[PDB]
Amino acid sequence: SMTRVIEVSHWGNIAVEENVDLKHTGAVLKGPFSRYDYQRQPDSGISSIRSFKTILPAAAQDVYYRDEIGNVSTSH
Amino acid sequence: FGFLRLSYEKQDTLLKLLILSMAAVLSFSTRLFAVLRFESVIHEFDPY
């Protein structure tokens, strides 16, 4: 599910916030998840998804990335 | 001589208001260092 909220203000600004719920629908993982193996070997968890890129509007300003429990600093 | 012509009662009250007003501003402002440097989050274990 995704909820897209668009607010237009007469003071020269429109603010858009999108709430995204994401689920990985690939084959279910079986057995324990080894952090040590995952870091050490490139092949480990090859199906797993690490990151994705979003193409935003050219004029987008003050972009913020956060979660329910606080900010997330990993986005570039 | 502008300050002198004012009554002393005016001078004492004016200084009293200015000193107290500033002190309130400093008390609130000084506590914002964490919120600016880091995200606006609850701190410590007990507050949660």
Partner: protein, 79 residues
């Protein structure tokens, strides 16, 4: 009545203006507000006039109230 046929709109007050307006309006409001309080505390039953108090209060409220709006926009909390 389509976007290309019609014109475009922007706020009359440009963004760069906002910092200057907020500072000027608030300072004027503050000066009158201080004057109102000092006059009230110093004044006594026989030394106070309603007409003077109303004029100072009304002027102070007008200047500061507009200044606050510019402050909110400058901060970015658009109404």
């Amino acid at each position: 009545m389509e976007l290309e046929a019609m014109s475009r709109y922007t706020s009359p007050v440009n963004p760069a203006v906002f910092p200057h307006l907020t500072v000027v309006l608030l300072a004027i409001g503050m000066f009158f507000t201080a004057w109102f309080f000092v006059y009230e505390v110093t004044s006594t039953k026989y030394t106070r006039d309603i007409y003077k108090e109303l004029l100072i209060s009304l002027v102070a409220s007008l200047f500061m109230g507009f200044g606050v709006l510019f402050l909110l926009l400058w901060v970015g909390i658009y109404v």
